[PDB]
Design a binder for this molecule. Structure first.
Ligand SMILES: *[C@@H]1O[C@H](CO)[C@@H](O[C@@H]2O[C@H](CO)[C@@H](O[C@@H]3O[C@H](CO)[C@@H](O)[C@H](O)[C@@H]3O)[C@H](O)[C@H]2NC(C)=O)[C@H](O)[C@H]1NC(C)=O
Ligand SMILES: *[C@@H]1O[C@H](CO)[C@@H](O[C@@H]2O[C@H](CO)[C@@H](O[C@@H]3O[C@H](CO)[C@@H](O)[C@H](O)[C@@H]3O)[C@H](O)[C@H]2NC(C)=O)[C@H](O)[C@H]1NC(C)=O
Ligand SMILES: *[C@@H]1O[C@H](CO)[C@@H](O[C@@H]2O[C@H](CO)[C@@H](O)[C@H](O)[C@H]2NC(C)=O)[C@H](O)[C@H]1NC(C)=O
Ligand SMILES: *[C@@H]1O[C@H](CO)[C@@H](O[C@@H]2O[C@H](CO)[C@@H](O)[C@H](O)[C@H]2NC(C)=O)[C@H](O)[C@H]1NC(C)=O
Ligand SMILES: *[C@@H]1O[C@H](CO)[C@@H](O[C@@H]2O[C@H](CO)[C@@H](O)[C@H](O)[C@H]2NC(C)=O)[C@H](O)[C@H]1NC(C)=O
Ligand SMILES: *[C@@H]1O[C@H](CO)[C@@H](O[C@@H]2O[C@H](CO)[C@@H](O)[C@H](O)[C@H]2NC(C)=O)[C@H](O)[C@H]1NC(C)=O
Ligand SMILES: *[C@@H]1O[C@H](CO)[C@@H](O[C@@H]2O[C@H](CO)[C@@H](O)[C@H](O)[C@H]2NC(C)=O)[C@H](O)[C@H]1NC(C)=O
Ligand SMILES: *[C@@H]1O[C@H](CO)[C@@H](O)[C@H](O)[C@H]1NC(C)=O
Ligand SMILES: *[C@@H]1O[C@H](CO)[C@@H](O)[C@H](O)[C@H]1NC(C)=O
Ligand SMILES: *[C@@H]1O[C@H](CO)[C@@H](O)[C@H](O)[C@H]1NC(C)=O
Ligand SMILES: *[C@@H]1O[C@H](CO)[C@@H](O)[C@H](O)[C@H]1NC(C)=O
Ligand SMILES: *[C@@H]1O[C@H](CO)[C@@H](O)[C@H](O)[C@H]1NC(C)=O
Ligand SMILES: *[C@@H]1O[C@H](CO)[C@@H](O)[C@H](O)[C@H]1NC(C)=O
Ligand SMILES: *[C@@H]1O[C@H](CO)[C@@H](O)[C@H](O)[C@H]1NC(C)=O
Ligand SMILES: *[C@@H]1O[C@H](CO)[C@@H](O)[C@H](O)[C@H]1NC(C)=O
Ligand SMILES: *[C@@H]1O[C@H](CO)[C@@H](O)[C@H](O)[C@H]1NC(C)=O
Ligand SMILES: *[C@@H]1O[C@H](CO)[C@@H](O)[C@H](O)[C@H]1NC(C)=O
Ligand SMILES: *[C@@H]1O[C@H](CO)[C@@H](O)[C@H](O)[C@H]1NC(C)=O
Ligand SMILES: *[C@@H]1O[C@H](CO)[C@@H](O)[C@H](O)[C@H]1NC(C)=O
Lengths: 49, 50, 98, 148, 98, 50, 49, 49, 49, 49
């Protein structure tokens, strides 16, 4: 029981984006935020997803 | 000012939790729970090595 | 609960009870989007304690005195256990010095 | 059997001693950004005291209490043909009433928008802020179009 | 009748002997007191170097038992943001560590 | 051995409720999300890989 | 050191009649030699442990 | 000092004996000295106060 | 002998748990730039089960 | 001219803020004068000359 509640919480944290009322962003922006942490993105039309 | 006052607040509860005289309230928070966990290992290293 | 093992704990008066995982709040990587975002504003300080053992009181034993209790002729039977004492006494000596 | 007890304990103390040396180098002397290594929370400084056969660490960390809601915008578009993003991914541009400010995402530290806070890119996204060169003085106060 | 002593060996020679007794045993001509044991050696005590070490004790090349001082370093500092005279590294050298 | 594991297993409702196939869009994470309880009486079960 | 400790355990009598398994059967009858060999078996399994 | 007295004063377990006290034996040997007569030597701790 | 196996087993498990807790904090809850700690390449996100 | 990250190819239009002024020129720098610097930084208008 506790493991399913442990791994489940960790999996769903990727959808969090620090928004008001914790409304989840589309997951493409969770990936895009994590790409910016590598290098500052300039592809704004977002073809590579 | 709040950062200094809060640090003084926590730094005193650490001493009270080490002595254990605040026993009925040591479980009131996670910050004091780490003190209990520390006392649990320091208990073991003293009672087992002999 | 004051004593715990696995999912079972017992509180002060002796009642057994199931344990709940500790509730926390995971952090989130703030996204680059035109929308409403929440940013930490008002800060408080906390102190968290951690203990780590860095040494263990080393003990060395003499393989001859412990076994033969200083008896003279017992030594000339233990010496036929050629590799016994050196294994015991080097394993303790080298660990202490390192 | 006694030697078996000692070698097993030396295995543990050796593994825990390495972690103590790491925490002296990375939490006490230095300031760490590794998550959870020097305590749950944002690390500031640490203290160390002697303990029976070991050390005790007092990790001083920050935990947030309140949050602020801000109308953030992804970027800027000027004349519809020139796009700007922020120079650091950890910064955010947000509106405060009738003017724009720039803040960090880890801590709320308001900043007046300088032109050096931005990086020019070769396309716009439509969801950017929509202004003209005659109006960039309302977002970046120092900007004054000299060619115009 | 014969409790165990500990001999000290360095570079295949014997240099000292931890003793429980006020004698000049094993031919060493100089005896010194320590908090929990006598110590005998041919040390001159004109020495300050440590080739062997245990706990807070150590021995010279001639077998003089000395206390090991903690080794000296210069801790780095977080250069503060302040209007003052600061000091900044200017010259550099290369060091290799094994 | 039990205390080490019990401190590690933390939980968060605010994020657990987002462990869903809808929260990830084109990224098919269906084989790892917790299974819906077949007959209630537990919060979740093993995933398609667990 | 571990291998030398292990190979030295093979000269142990373990208070059997002799350290050589073949020598026991050269000296004793089968119903009596089994009770002597069993000491060497138990002792040498302790050496491997 | 609290973390050195709040815990049990285990003087009957591991204690680095005064070897020079034991062999003169003006009084009946202590526990630390009795272990020394059996070859067990507890060395002073490396974590010097 | 049984206690020896159990104690030796808990030593390896404790070290493997300590590494697991590090990787939960640094590869799952965060994005790592430590090379070779969360894959051989540019880490993006991690999942746990 | 363009500017890109070394970790990932992300093209960028050179703004004057992308540079840092230093005391000396290397024999390998781009050889340019203030009047025609606009070919490297499109938005730079020489407000002295
Ligand atoms: C890193 O390790 C090196 C050890 O190789 C440390 O460097 C050495 O540190 C000592 C203590 O600070 C220096 O001694 C000093 O020398 C000057 C000049 O004689 C004297 O005025 C001081 O009172 C002291 O004796 C030593 O010169 C220095 N140099 C070298 C080349 O090793 C270093 O401190 C360590 N650094 C850190 C940040 O841990
Ligand atoms: C995401 O991944 C899951 C697997 O974890 C995909 O579910 C699987 O989809 C296949 C293809 O539909 C299913 O197999 C076939 O299903 C049909 C309809 O039941 C049946 O007629 C065929 O005989 C065959 O079984 C497979 O059973 C299913 N597995 C599970 C565990 O649900 C899912 O479709 C993927 N979704 C997306 C949007 O990528
Ligand atoms: C770090 O530790 C603190 C506890 O000191 C956690 O904060 C608690 O979170 C729970 C979540 O349900 C709240 O109910 C408590 O009121 C919080 N208390 C305090 C004192 O902070 C926190 O969640 C932990 N993690 C992080 C990332 O901050
Ligand atoms: C411009 O950037 C924003 C994100 O900052 C994009 O917003 C969402 O992006 C996905 C594609 O990754 C779209 O499917 C969504 O429709 C967008 N959100 C909303 C609420 O509509 C935006 O689409 C980006 N521009 C383009 C062309 O993809
Ligand atoms: C900024 O201006 C542009 C150009 O007028 C807007 O882009 C158009 O938006 C409308 C809907 O508002 C669409 O029907 C058009 O197709 C868009 N243009 C193109 C070329 O696709 C953009 O919406 C404006 N954005 C803001 C935030 O004001
Ligand atoms: C700055 O100039 C130095 C020379 O002063 C450059 O070094 C030269 O690099 C070329 C590369 O093809 C070699 O052929 C030369 O033989 C090098 N000369 C010397 C003296 O090393 C250096 O590469 C330049 N540095 C930068 C940062 O651009
Ligand atoms: C930029 O201009 C400088 C100076 O005119 C050039 O450096 C000269 O290169 C010639 C090559 O034959 C040498 O003879 C001179 O001695 C150099 N001058 C100095 C002051 O060192 C440089 O080569 C030019 N570089 C580029 C990339 O155009
Ligand atoms: C954690 O929060 C949940 C919210 O549903 C609550 O039911 C549970 O009792 C809480 N447990 C603890 C230990 O705080
Ligand atoms: C952001 O907050 C404003 C009020 O400050 C509100 O009008 C708006 O609906 C909020 N949400 C979004 C998604 O814009
Ligand atoms: C910040 O936190 C402290 C907590 O005691 C509070 O007194 C203070 O009013 C809060 N707000 C600001 C704006 O400082
Ligand atoms: C040890 O004996 C010497 C003479 O051999 C004497 O000077 C010294 O005081 C004695 N020390 C102790 C501690 O008994
Ligand atoms: C120690 O010094 C004495 C001084 O008389 C000398 O006789 C002896 O040979 C030296 N060496 C040893 C190993 O005792
Ligand atoms: C000890 O050694 C130093 C260095 O060789 C020497 O100068 C000194 O005179 C010696 N003697 C004493 C008594 O310090
Ligand atoms: C370190 O410095 C102190 C004085 O600051 C000195 O007494 C000591 O001898 C030095 N350390 C060593 C190992 O020599
Ligand atoms: C810096 O130090 C110099 C010399 O000590 C002194 O003249 C100067 O006023 C100092 N300035 C400040 C800001 O402390
Ligand atoms: C650094 O020190 C060396 C001597 O070790 C000196 O020759 C050199 O000029 C110094 N560096 C500078 C930039 O002055
Ligand atoms: C996913 O969300 C939908 C709607 O809340 C629900 O029907 C479904 O059971 C959820 N599944 C999981 C595994 O959370
Ligand atoms: C100024 O504007 C004119 C018209 O767009 C253009 O020809 C010229 O290149 C611009 N120059 C600069 C330095 O921006
Ligand atoms: C502009 O450059 C000229 C070059 O001759 C110089 O005279 C003048 O001082 C510069 N302008 C300013 C404001 O310094």
């Amino acid at each position: 029981e506790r493991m399913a509640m442990y791994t489940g919480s960790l999996i769903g944290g990727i959808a969090l984006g620090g928004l008001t009322s914790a409304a989840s962003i589309p997951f493409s922006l969770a990936i895009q935020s994590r790409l910016n942490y590598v290098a500052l993105q300039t592809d704004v039309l977002q073809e590579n997803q | 000012r709040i950062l200094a006052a809060s640090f003084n607040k926590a730094m005193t509860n650490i001493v009270d939790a080490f002595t254990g005289v605040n026993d009925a309230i040591t479980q009131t928070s996670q910050a004091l729970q780490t003190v209990a966990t520390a006392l649990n290992k320091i208990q073991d290293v003293v009672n087992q090595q002999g | 609960a004051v004593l715990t093992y696995s999912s079972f704990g017992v509180c002060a008066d002796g009642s057994i009870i199931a344990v709940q995982p500790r509730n926390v709040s995971y952090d989130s990587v703030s996204a680059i989007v035109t929308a409403n975002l929440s940013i930490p504003f008002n800060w408080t300080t906390s102190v968290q304690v951690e203990y780590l053992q860095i040494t263990s009181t080393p003990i060395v034993v003499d393989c001859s005195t412990y076994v033969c209790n200083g008896n003279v002729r017992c030594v000339e039977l233990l010496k036929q256990y050629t590799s016994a004492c050196k294994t015991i006494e080097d394993a303790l000596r080298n660990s202490a010095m390192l | 059997v006694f030697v078996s007890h000692t070698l097993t304990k030396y295995t543990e103390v050796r593994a825990s001693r390495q972690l103590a040396q790491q925490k002296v180098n990375e939490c006490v002397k230095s300031q760490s950004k590794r998550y959870g290594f020097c305590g749950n929370g944002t690390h500031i400084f640490s203290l160390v005291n002697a303990a029976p056969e070991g050390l005790v660490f007092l990790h001083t960390v920050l935990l947030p209490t309140q949050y602020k809601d801000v109308e953030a915008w992804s970027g800027l578009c000027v004349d519809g043909i020139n796009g700007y993003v922020l120079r650091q991914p950890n910064l955010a541009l947000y509106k405060e009433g009738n003017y724009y400010r720039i803040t960090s995402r880890i801590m709320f530290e308001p900043r007046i928008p300088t032109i050096a806070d931005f990086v020019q890119i070769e396309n716009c996204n439509v969801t950017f802020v929509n202004i003209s060169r005659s109006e960039l003085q309302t977002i970046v106060p120092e900007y004054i179009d000299v060619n115009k | 009748c014969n409790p165990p002593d500990q001999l000290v060996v360095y570079q295949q020679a014997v240099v000292g002997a931890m003793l429980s007794e006020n004698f000049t045993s094993y031919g060493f001509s100089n005896v010194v007191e320590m908090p929990k044991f006598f110590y005998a050696s041919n040390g001159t005590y004109n020495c300050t170097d440590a080739v062997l070490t245990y706990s807070s004790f150590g021995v010279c090349a001639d077998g003089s038992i000395i206390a090991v001082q903690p080794r000296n370093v210069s801790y780095d500092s977080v250069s503060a943001i302040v209007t003052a005279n600061l000091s900044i590294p200017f010259n550099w050298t290369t060091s290799v560590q094994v | 051995e039990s205390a080490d594991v019990s401190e590690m297993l933390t939980f968060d409702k605010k994020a657990f409720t987002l462990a869903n196939v809808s929260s990830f869009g084109d990224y098919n994470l269906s084989s790892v999300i917790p299974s819906l309880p077949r007959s209630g009486s537990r919060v979740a079960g093993r995933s398609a890989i667990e | 050191n571990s291998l030398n400790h292990l190979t030295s355990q093979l000269r142990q009598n373990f208070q059997a009649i002799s350290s050589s398994i073949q020598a026991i059967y050269d000296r004793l009858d089968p119903p009596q030699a089994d009770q002597q060999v069993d000491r060497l078996i138990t002792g040498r399994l302790a050496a491997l442990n | 000092d609290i973390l050195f007295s709040k815990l049990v004063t285990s003087g009957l377990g591991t204690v680095d004996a005064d070897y020079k006290k034991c062999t003169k034996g003006l009084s009946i040997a202590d526990l630390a000295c009795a272990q020394y007569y059996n070859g067990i030597m507890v060395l002073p701790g490396v974590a010097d106060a």
